[PDB]
Amino acid sequence: ADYDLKFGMNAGTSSNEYKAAEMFAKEVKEKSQGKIEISLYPSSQLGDDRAMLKQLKDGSLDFTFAESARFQLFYPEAAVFALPYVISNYNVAQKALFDTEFGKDLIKKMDKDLGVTLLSQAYNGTRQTTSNRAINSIADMKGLKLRVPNAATNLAYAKYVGASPTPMAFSEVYLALQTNAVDGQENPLAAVQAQKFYEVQKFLAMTNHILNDQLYLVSNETYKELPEDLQKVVKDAAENAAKYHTKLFVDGEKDLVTFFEKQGVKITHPDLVPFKESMKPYYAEFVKQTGQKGESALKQIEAINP
């Protein structure tokens, strides 16, 4: 009869992540018969994700979100999760995490080394490519000034598919696109909406190049000290929330394709075989850099059938 718990996130109060985190809190409060109350700290009120992960380890924050690829910070091979074309769809991302030796061991490491218990995994959208001219096939990527965040995997995507990667302040993007200083960008659909890139981009291509998940993480210092019945309430709620979280993305993506088209955007579905094939030299550079541990992770994840 009473645990006052804290759930920190990067995501804002208008996000799907936030909405699912509210579902989780409400469920935990109801099913705990009011014994557990979870307060939400959106928009990095408590720090960035690195800082919030550290708070989970030390026990000063109870819950947070992270994506599986973010653990590349501790184990370089965990970058496998955001390698372009490695994770074909969300099913692959789930089997990668929970149904490979690599994934299982990563989960154990989060527990033992990082003090974190992985309660559930949700889908957080797939990255797509908008542009000012149609992407009918990989040929059209040549010469495309493609804005990417300053992240190695996104730069590799732009590079190896033949585009000209163009790192730029996120604020500057809308007007760069409007004046054709940049030809396209690469982001999930939620972001195209949020930034109204549909106003300044009349083409979107389902390039499905990088898939994002989100993990419901709890501090060991909190979770392992809860009564077994409250542990179950927390775990059950996280699983329920993750399934909701997934559906918000899956549905939102479909809704948004339709709305974008309403706004004049034309959608294409280009053949991704050559897109994936072009990544092989970056995969080689991934294995070179992350060693036998990263060769192993890749082989385990191919053979997952999508």
- For Zn ion, the binding residues in 218-257 under the rule CB under 5 A are none
**Of residues 30 and 105, the one with the C-beta less far from Zn ion:** 105
How far is the C-alpha of 184 from the C-alpha of 165, rounded, in Å? 10
CB of 124 to Zn ion, least distance (A): 20
**Of residues 48 and 105, the one with the C-beta less far from Zn ion:** 105
Residue 127 is labelled as binding a ligand? yes
Please name the residues in contact with 208: beta carbons below 8 A apart, sequence gap of 6 or more: 88, 89, 126, 127, 128, 272
Residue 187 is labelled as binding a ligand? yes
Binding marks (x or -) toward Zn ion, 77..116, rule CB under 5 A?
------------------------x---x-----------
CB of 156 to Zn ion, least distance (A): 26
Residue 305 is labelled as binding a ligand? no
| Partners of 145 in beta bridges | 164
How far is the C-alpha of 66 from the C-alpha of 102, rounded, in Å? 18
Give the total of residues touching Zn ion (CB under 5 A).
Answer: 4
How far is the C-alpha of 5 from the C-alpha of 173, rounded, in Å? 38
Which H or E run includes 199? none
**Is residue 271 a contact point for Zn ion (CB under 5 A)?**
no
**Of residues 124 and 128, the one with the C-beta less far from Zn ion:** 128
**Of residues 176 and 189, the one with the C-beta less far from Zn ion:** 189
**Of residues 4 and 271, the one with the C-beta less far from Zn ion:** 4
Q: Which two tokens stand for residue 26?
A: 């409400």
Q: Judge residue 29's burial from the number of C-beta atoms within 10 Å of its C-beta, 0-12 exposed, 13-18 middle, 19 or more buried.
A: middle
Decide: helix, strand or coil at residue 141.
helix
Question: Apex CA 153: angle with CA 250 and CA 54, to 5°?
Answer: 80
- For Zn ion, the binding residues in 2-41 under the rule CB under 5 A are 2, 4
| Partners of 186 in beta bridges | 129
CB of 66 to Zn ion, least distance (A): 21
Q: Which of 42, 79, 80 is nearest to 64 (CA)?
A: 42
CB of 23 to Zn ion, least distance (A): 21
CB of 227 to Zn ion, least distance (A): 16
Q: Taking CB positions, which residue lies at the least distance from Zn ion?
A: 2
CB of 4 to Zn ion, least distance (A): 4
Residue 70 is labelled as binding a ligand? no
Beta strands in the chain (DSSP E): 3-8, 36-41, 63-66, 116-131, 145-148, 164-167, 184-188, 203-205, 211-219, 266-268
- For Zn ion, the binding residues in 105-164 under the rule CB under 5 A are 105
CB of 104 to Zn ion, least distance (A): 7
* Beta strand pairing call for 116-131 and 203-205: antiparallel
Residue 49 is labelled as binding a ligand? yes
> Using CA atoms in the order 63, 65, 68, 74, what is the torsion angle rounded to 10 degrees?
-60
Span of 1-9, 165-173, 183-191, 238-246 interacting with Zn ion by CB under 5 A? 1-9
**Of residues 20 and 204, the one with the C-beta less far from Zn ion:** 204
**Of residues 163 and 205, the one with the C-beta less far from Zn ion:** 205
Residue 183 is labelled as binding a ligand? no
- Known binding residues for N-acetyl-beta-neuraminate are 10, 49, 67, 127, 147, 187
- Known binding residues are 10, 49, 67, 127, 147, 187
- The residues that touch Zn ion, with contacts defined as CB under 5 A, are 2, 4, 101, 105
